[PDB]
Amino acid sequence: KVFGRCELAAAMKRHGLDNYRGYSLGNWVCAAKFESNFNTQATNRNTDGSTDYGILQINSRWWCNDGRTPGSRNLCNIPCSALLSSDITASVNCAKKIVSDGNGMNAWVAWRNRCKGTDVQAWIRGCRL
Ligand SMILES: [Cl-]
Ligand SMILES: [Cl-]
Ligand SMILES: [Cl-]
Ligand SMILES: [Cl-]
Ligand SMILES: [Cl-]
Ligand SMILES: [Cl-]
Ligand SMILES: [Cl-]
Ligand code: NA
Numbered sequence: 001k002v003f004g005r006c007e008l009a010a011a012m013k014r015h016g017l018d019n020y021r022g023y024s025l026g027n028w029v030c031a032a033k034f035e036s037n038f039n040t041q042a043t044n045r046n047t048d049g050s051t052d053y054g055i056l057q058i059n060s061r062w063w064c065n066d067g068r069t070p071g072s073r074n075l076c077n078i079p080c081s082a083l084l085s086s087d088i089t090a091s092v093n094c095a096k097k098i099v100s101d102g103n104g105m106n107a108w109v110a111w112r113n114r115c116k117g118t119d120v121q122a123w124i125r126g127c128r129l
Contacts, residue, residue: 001040001041002037002039002040003032003038003039005029005033005038006124006127008038008088009026009029009129010128012032015088016092016096017095020096021100024124026120026121026122027105027115029120030111030120031108031111032056033123034111034114034115035056035111040054040055040088041054042054042057046061048061049070050069051069051080053066053084056083056091056094056108061073062075063076063097063098064079064094065078065079065080066079066080076090
C-alpha cells in the first residue's frame with residue numbers, strides 16, 4: 001500500500017505513535033516519507049546482508065526474522081514479511097520498541113539526516129487528525 005501523507009498521519013495516530021517517546025506525529029510521517037516514500041512494501045538490502053522492511057525500513061540485523069541474516073536477532077518477535085502489510089500495526093509496534101532502545105529516532109539514519117531539527121509539523125499540515 002502507498003499511503004498519502006495525512007492518511008498515514010491518521011493511521012499512525014490510530015496506532016498510538018503520536019508523541020510516542022516524545023516524538024510528534026510529523027517526526028514519524030517525515031521518517032516514513034524518507035525511509036519508504038510511504039510504501040508499506042518497500043524492501044532494501046544493506047551492504048552487510050541484512051534487509052530493511054516496510055514503511056519505517058526496520059532492519060533484520062536486530063528487529064525481525066527473514067531467515068537470511070546470519071547472527072541477527074528478532075527483538076520484535078515477528079517475521080520481517082509482517083512489516084510489509086497494508087495494516088501498519090506490526091511496523092508501529094516494532095518502531096515503538098526501536099525508539100525506546102536508547103537513541104530515540106536516531107536509529108533511523110534518514111530521520112537524523114533529513115527530518116531531525118526541521119519543521120516536521122509541515123508533514124501533518126492541513127490533516128484532519
Ligand atoms: Cl508527501
Ligand atoms: Cl508534528
Ligand atoms: Cl536470519
Ligand atoms: Cl532475538
Ligand atoms: Cl519468522
Ligand atoms: Cl493501518
Ligand atoms: Cl529521545
Ligand atoms: Na533477524
